[PDB]
Amino acid sequence: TTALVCDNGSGLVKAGFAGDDAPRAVFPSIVGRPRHQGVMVGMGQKDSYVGDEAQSKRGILTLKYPIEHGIITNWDDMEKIWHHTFYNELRVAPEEHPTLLTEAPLNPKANREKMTQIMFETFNVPAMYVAIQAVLSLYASGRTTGIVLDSGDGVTHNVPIYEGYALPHAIMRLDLAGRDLTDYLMKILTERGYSFVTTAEREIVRDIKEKLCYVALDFENEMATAASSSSLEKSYELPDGQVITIGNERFRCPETLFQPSFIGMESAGIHETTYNSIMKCDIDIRKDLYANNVMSGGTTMYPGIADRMQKEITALAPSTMKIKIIAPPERKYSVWIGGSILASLSTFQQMWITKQEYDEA
Amino acid sequence: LKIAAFNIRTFGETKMSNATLASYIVRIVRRYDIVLIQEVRDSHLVAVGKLLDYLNQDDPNTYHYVVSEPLGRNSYKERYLFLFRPNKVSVLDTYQYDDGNDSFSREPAVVKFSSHSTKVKEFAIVALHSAPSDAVAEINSLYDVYLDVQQKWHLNDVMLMGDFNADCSYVTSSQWSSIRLRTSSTFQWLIPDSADTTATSTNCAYDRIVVAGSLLQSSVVPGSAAPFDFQAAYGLSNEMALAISDHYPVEVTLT
Numbered sequence: 001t002t003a004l005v006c007d008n009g010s011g012l013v014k015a016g017f018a019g020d021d022a023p024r025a026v027f028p029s030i031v032g033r034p035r036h037q038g039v040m041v042g043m044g045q046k047d048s049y050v051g052d053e054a055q056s057k058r059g060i061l062t063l064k065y066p067i068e069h070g071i072i073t074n075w076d077d078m079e080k081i082w083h084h085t086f087y088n089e090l091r092v093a094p095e096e097h098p099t100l101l102t103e104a105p106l107n108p109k110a111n112r113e114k115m116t117q118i119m120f121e122t123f124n125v126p127a128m129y130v131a132i133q134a135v136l137s138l139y140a141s142g143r144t145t146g147i148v149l150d151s152g153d154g155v156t157h158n159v160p161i162y163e164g165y166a167l168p169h170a171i172m173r174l175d176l177a178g179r180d181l182t183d184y185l186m187k188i189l190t191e192r193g194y195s196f197v198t199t200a201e202r203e204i205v206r207d208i209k210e211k212l213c214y215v216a217l218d219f220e221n222e223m224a225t226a227a228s229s230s231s232l233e234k235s236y237e238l239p240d241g242q243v244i245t246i247g248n249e250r251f252r253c254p255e256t257l258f259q260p261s262f263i264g265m266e267s268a269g270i271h272e273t274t275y276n277s278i279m280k281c282d283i284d285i286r287k288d289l290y291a292n293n294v295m296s297g298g299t300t301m302y303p304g305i306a307d308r309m310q311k312e313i314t315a316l317a318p319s320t321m322k323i324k325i326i327a328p329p330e331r332k333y334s335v336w337i338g339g340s341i342l343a344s345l346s347t348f349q350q351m352w353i354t355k356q357e358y359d360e361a
Numbered sequence: 362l363k364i365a366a367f368n369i370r371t372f373g374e375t376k377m378s379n380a381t382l383a384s385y386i387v388r389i390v391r392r393y394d395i396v397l398i399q400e401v402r403d404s405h406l407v408a409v410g411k412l413l414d415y416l417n418q419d420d421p422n423t424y425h426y427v428v429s430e431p432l433g434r435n436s437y438k439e440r441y442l443f444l445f446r447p448n449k450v451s452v453l454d455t456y457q458y459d460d461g462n463d464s465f466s467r468e469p470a471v472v473k474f475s476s477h478s479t480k481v482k483e484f485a486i487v488a489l490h491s492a493p494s495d496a497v498a499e500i501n502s503l504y505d506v507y508l509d510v511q512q513k514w515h516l517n518d519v520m521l522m523g524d525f526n527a528d529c530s531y532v533t534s535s536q537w538s539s540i541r542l543r544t545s546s547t548f549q550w551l552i553p554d555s556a557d558t559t560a561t562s563t564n565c566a567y568d569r570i571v572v573a574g575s576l577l578q579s580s581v582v583p584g585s586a587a588p589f590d591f592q593a594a595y596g597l598s599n600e601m602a603l604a605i606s607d608h609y610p611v612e613v614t615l616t
């Protein structure tokens with residue numbers, strides 16, 4: 001009877017049981033099929049690998065990412081991901097559990113209907129629900145009005161929400177997020193003199209990104225500080241034990257969120273798309289959006305990012321406007337947490353679509 | 362049927378990304394119907410996949426594979442990789458010896474083949490790249506691996522092969538009496554103690570091919586087992602030779 005919560009992203013699946021405070025399973029949203037015929041010693045021929053095993057065996061596979069910019073685009077591979085999630089990761093029988101799934105802002109209705117069909121017809125779940133990721137993040141922060149900045153591995157959105165209603169006319173999408181930042185870090189470390197290009201080197205670069213990068217409050221001053229002293233350098237010990245030093249790359253990498261031109265994209269930065277989204281909303285709700293900017297997603301985890309957003313939005317907003325950025329410590333999982341809270345409410349239990357309803361509709 | 366075992370020094374992405382060195386490895390592999398590659402240091406199977414891409418570029422089924430996970434007692438890990446031509450032989454079954462890291466630093470991969478072109482119809486190959494400082498004990502342990510294959514597959518026809526480090530300072534003349542794989546009359550040692558299996562200036566029979574079982578021993582073409590000196594074969598400089606590997610493949614033909 002425990003509900004499951006599955007939050008499927010472009011880069012990572014976050015899955016677990018409703019009422020838990022964190023997802024039990026977090027793993028790459030990847031399906032890989034062997035490019036050649038053979039076996040691992042003591043194993044039979046495998047048709048495909050999903051998740052961590054696909055990443056660690058990727059050299060003899062072709063990898064597919066069934067979720068692109070947050071939207072499901074390969075249904076056969078998405079089914080494999082869900083099967084792996086239920087049977088391998090959570091080790092549950094799906095016909096025994098109501099299941100909450102999440103979807104991206106602006107997910108087409110036909111996509112939601114296909115998700116629902118698969119859950120009921122392929123997995124035989126007894127009930128299900130689909131929630132919008134940004135609305136769940138807002139709910140997790142204890143608010144029903146605010147504007148969510150959600151930035152993951154593949155996509156960044158701004159989603160204004162008014163009394164629990166995500167306003168789709170005002171949603172902004174930016175096709176720049178964590179995977180782009182990792183690639184850009186690889187590039188600029190390489191320019192410095194390092195050599196980071198292989199699959200494994202990308203794994204290390206992702207780790208350097210997550211451990212040493214931060215958002216400068218004043219980027220040009222920070223560049224000058226990095227040039228005048230060694231105070232912003234940080235050391236990082238590689239798997240083999242050799243230590244390297246990284247300087248202005250630490251803050252140049254996530255600067256790209258505010259200056260997408262760093263990777264040759266002509267788009268407004270996240271502060272500008274936040275402002276633009278608020279400005280698409282009725283003026284009478286804007287005070288509440290500016291005072292409730294909630295950040296969500298792995299790519300909002302950079303130290304400094306909330307302060308820099310507060311500064312940049314203050315520069316754009318009317319001069320007397322109260323501006324507040326809310327960046328929860330658990331915000332890499334706040335979509336999943338909002339889902340876990342919602343699915344575990346006695347109050348919620350009549351919002352489940354049951355298989356009987358699906359049979360009658 | 363040509364079978365080989367080849368320790369390719371630090372076989373991995375850097376070496377397979379070198380077009381010249383990759384070509385030489387492909388040329389060597391192509392000689393064989395079954396080849397065991399050792400010292401595969403390939404954290405994500407990328408180099409293995411690149412080798413297979415080259416081997417299977419024209420006909421997608423030129424070679425099939427059997428590959429281990431990374432093996433070792435500590436952080437330094439290596440895989441065993443068998444490549445085989447599916448039109449010549451078929452893999453019937455595989456397993457990793459476990460009775461494992463107690464007896465071997467790299468637990469032997471064991472593959473059962475069926476083989477319709479040769480006197481022997483089914484035979485197993487046991488792979489070992491021994492830890493040099495433990496070579497006596499590890500080679501002696503292969504005797505127990507042999508018994509295991511016998512018990513598991515009711516099969517006496519077994520080839521044991523690889524870089525056993527079986528010579529020079531790792532196994533001395535007086536130490537052979539301590540190795541049941543040598544003292545038992547069950548086994549024929551096809552690469553003699555006199556052979557040089559190193560591409561470097563040492564003169565050592567490190568790499569070995571051992572055969573057990575009547576039919577298998579009778580399938581061996583007498584005289585065919587030997588190291589393949591690819592420096593000589595391909596008219597290479599010693600420097601190019603060593604950039605490929607510090608060992609030669611050891612090979613054998615079945616009739």
Ligand SMILES: Nc1ncnc2c1ncn2[C@@H]1O[C@H](COP(=O)(O)OP(=O)(O)OP(=O)(O)O)[C@@H](O)[C@H]1O
Nearest residue numbers: 009010011012152153154155178210297298299301
């Ligand atoms: N501490 C950190 N600092 C910076 N980036 C991080 C941190 N932790 C995770 N990330 C990045 O967050 C991304 C994954 O976040 P998330 O799970 O929210 O994305 P997703 O849901 O898979 O993708 P999307 O929402 O774009 O579809 C990865 O790019 C990861 O490297």
Ligand SMILES: *[C@@H]1O[C@H](CO)[C@@H](O[C@@H]2O[C@H](CO)[C@@H](O)[C@H](O)[C@H]2NC(C)=O)[C@H](O)[C@H]1NC(C)=O
Nearest residue numbers: 378379380381382598599600601602603604605
């Ligand atoms: C591939 O490997 C070959 C052989 O090691 C490399 O050649 C060596 O490196 C440089 C090449 O400019 C020479 O100074 C050495 O003398 C070469 N050794 C030999 C034996 O020729 C070659 O560089 C590698 N190719 C690439 C692009 O990495």
Ligand SMILES: [Ca+2]
Nearest residue numbers: 009010133152
């Ligand atoms: Ca997401």
Ligand SMILES: [Ca+2]
Nearest residue numbers: 557559561563
């Ligand atoms: Ca020699």
Ligand SMILES: [Mg+2]
Nearest residue numbers: 554555565566
């Ligand atoms: Mg000798």
